[PDB]
């Protein structure tokens, strides 16, 4: 639509393309359609989802109450403009808030400010511009000036994607001043009008996209059960798991980085859960934390991935090896997970990336190396079937859940189902696979 395709290093783009142009897909669709689908895929990654979704902390508050409070907050943020919020029928702890589509109306100003790619993503997510994120600004820029903000997606500022207009809180002199970090540019007229939930009901809400919220529902944890979250940072799926069990049971959260673990404890504390035990521990060494084999009722592997399905995302300054180095780690963590899983237990493997190597190929690898594992259907089903290319039958592909960022054309801004459709299809790149363990080991 308005934004260019996601900015990737030619090598990386060629890698992804190699992954999305396997002979199976080319056989199933033809080369032209494969190419077009890949290009549209790269084109939809730059644009924000039509819906921002939030998870209600049902352990402390009801969905209706929080919905009303959010209605109030929204009619506060947008100067009396009230926008609808929808409770997802299948994911009833999830609220959907529509983002206002491409404003092709906003005309640019003379005073300009240029920001980084990540800062641009933040702006597209509904955040404001802060002084450290500004790399360039027009001279004679004063506080209160109406300025146009551009994103340097190629990272060539010591080419410019227009993000919208705002008012300056600082002057050029003040911006490039010697560390005012809490101010910068208030986005008053952005292209995408997404709201900010960074200080709105800290104990009742959690900013979490739809598939990530779907993960825990698919896992389907029950009260009294023992659950393991191998890679639990920052703790969204962990707290969700605890909340689904009404904080009754035990959820072990594991992470390798200390600070992230402290973040997990912080989030668990904010949402009032107590059945969570967080540990700074390497998930690859989890087997005897460490814990005895087959001691967990359910295990979630929200695996570390290339994350090439996140939206919005205007650029990725990554090497090819960085992108392609996830598979061995994922397989180690997966092995640990299988070893720690109880007989007739459930293992869920999830990623927020779009590559074959980190999704379908891992499912094939898992079903080959572990005869004790059996692929299972998922409820609810929200996303499309698995992508062809890893040598999986149609039945196996229909039991996986893959979210395609480019499945519908990019929206522009309705009925209930008309919004639910957008929230379900126009989403981020995500992958979910479900396994049950048949015998012991």
19 is in an annotated binding site: no
231 is in an annotated binding site: yes
Q: State the Rg of the chain over Cα.
A: 22
Q: Which residue numbers are catalytic?
A: 352
Going by C-alpha positions, the residue among 95, 12, 52 that lies closest to residue 354 is: 12
Question: Is there a contact between 278 and 253 (Cβ–Cβ < 8 Å)?
Answer: yes
Going by C-alpha positions, the residue among 277, 355, 287, 265 that lies closest to residue 316 is: 355
Decide the pairing of beta strands 296-302 and 341-351.
parallel
190 is in an annotated binding site: no
Prior bond of 27 cis (ω within 30°): no
3-state secondary structure of 337: helix
Distance of CA 347 to the CA centre of its chain: 20
The neighbour count for residue 438, using CB atoms within 10 Å, is 12
Name the token pair of 198: 């960074």
**Spans of all domains in the chain:** 1-101+194-441, 102-193
Backbone CA torsion sign across 417, 422, 428, 432: positive
What CA–CA distance (Å, rounded) separates 214 from 355? 20
- If you ran DSSP here, which 8-state letter would residue 165 be given? E
What CA–CA distance (Å, rounded) separates 316 from 292? 40
Name the token pair of 66: 């929080």
418 is in an annotated binding site: no
Name the token pair of 165: 């207009």
- Cα–Cα distance list, 297 to 215, 255, 389 (Å): 16, 19, 32
What CA–CA distance (Å, rounded) separates 63 from 419? 19
Q: What count of residues does the chain have?
A: 441
Prior bond of 234 cis (ω within 30°): yes
290 is in an annotated binding site: no
394 is in an annotated binding site: no
* Experimental method reported for this structure: X-ray
Q: What is the resolution of this structure in A?
A: 2.8
């Amino acid at each position: 639509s308005i934004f260019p395709k996601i900015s990737l290093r030619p090598e990386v783009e060629n890698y992804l393309k190699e992954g999305f142009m396997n002979k199976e897909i080319v056989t199933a669709l033809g080369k032209q359609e494969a190419e077009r689908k890949f290009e549209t895929l790269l084109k939809h990654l730059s644009h924000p989802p039509s819906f921002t979704t939030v998870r209600v902390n049902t352990h402390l508050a009801s969905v209706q109450h929080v919905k009303n409070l959010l209605l109030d907050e929204l009619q506060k943020q947008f100067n009396g403009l009230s926008v609808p919020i929808l409770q997802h029928p299948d994911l009833q702890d999830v609220l959907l808030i529509p983002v206002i589509g491409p404003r092709k109306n906003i005309k640019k100003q003379q005073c300009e400010a240029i920001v980084g790619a990540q800062c641009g993503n933040a702006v597209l997510r509904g955040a404001h511009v802060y002084a450290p994120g500004i790399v360039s600004a027009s001279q004679f820029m004063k506080a209160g000036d109406v300025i146009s903000v551009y994103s340097d997606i190629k990272g060539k500022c010591k080419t410019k994607v227009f993000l919208g207009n705002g008012i300056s809180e600082l002057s050029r002199k003040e911006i490039f001043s010697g560390l005012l970090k809490g101010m910068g540019i208030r986005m008053t007229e952005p292209v995408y009008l997404s709201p900010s939930f960074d200080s709105v009901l800290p104990r009742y809400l959690f900013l979490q996209n739809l598939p990530s919220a779907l993960v825990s529902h698919v896992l389907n944890p029950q009260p009294g059960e023992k659950i393991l979250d191998l890679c639990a940072a920052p703790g969204g799926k962990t707290t969700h798991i605890a909340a689904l069990m009404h904080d009754q049971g035990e959820v072990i959260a594991l992470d390798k980085i200390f600070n992230k673990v402290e973040k997990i404890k912080q989030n668990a504390l904010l949402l009032g859960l107590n059945s969570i035990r967080a540990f700074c521990f390497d998930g690859t060494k989890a087997v005897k934390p460490p814990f005895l084999p087959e001691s967990f009722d359910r295990i979630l592997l929200d695996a570390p991935c290339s994350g090439m399905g996140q939206r919005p995302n205007m650029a990725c300054t990554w090497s090819v090896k960085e992108v392609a180095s996830y598979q061995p780690l994922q397989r180690k963590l997966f092995t640990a997970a299988v070893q720690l899983l109880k007989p007739e237990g459930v293992l869920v493997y999830s990623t927020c990336t779009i590559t074959l190597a980190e999704n379908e190929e891992q499912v094939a690898w898992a079903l080959t190396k572990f005869p004790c594992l059996q692929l299972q259907p998922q409820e609810p089903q929200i996303g499309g079937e698995g992508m062809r290319g890893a040598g999986l039958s149609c039945e196996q592909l229909k039991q996986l859940q893959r979210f395609d960022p480019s499945a519908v054309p990019l929206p522009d801004t309705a009925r209930r189902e008309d919004m639910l459709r957008l929230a379900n299809k126009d989403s981020i790149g995500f992958f979910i696979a479900k396994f049950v363990k048949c015998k012991s080991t």
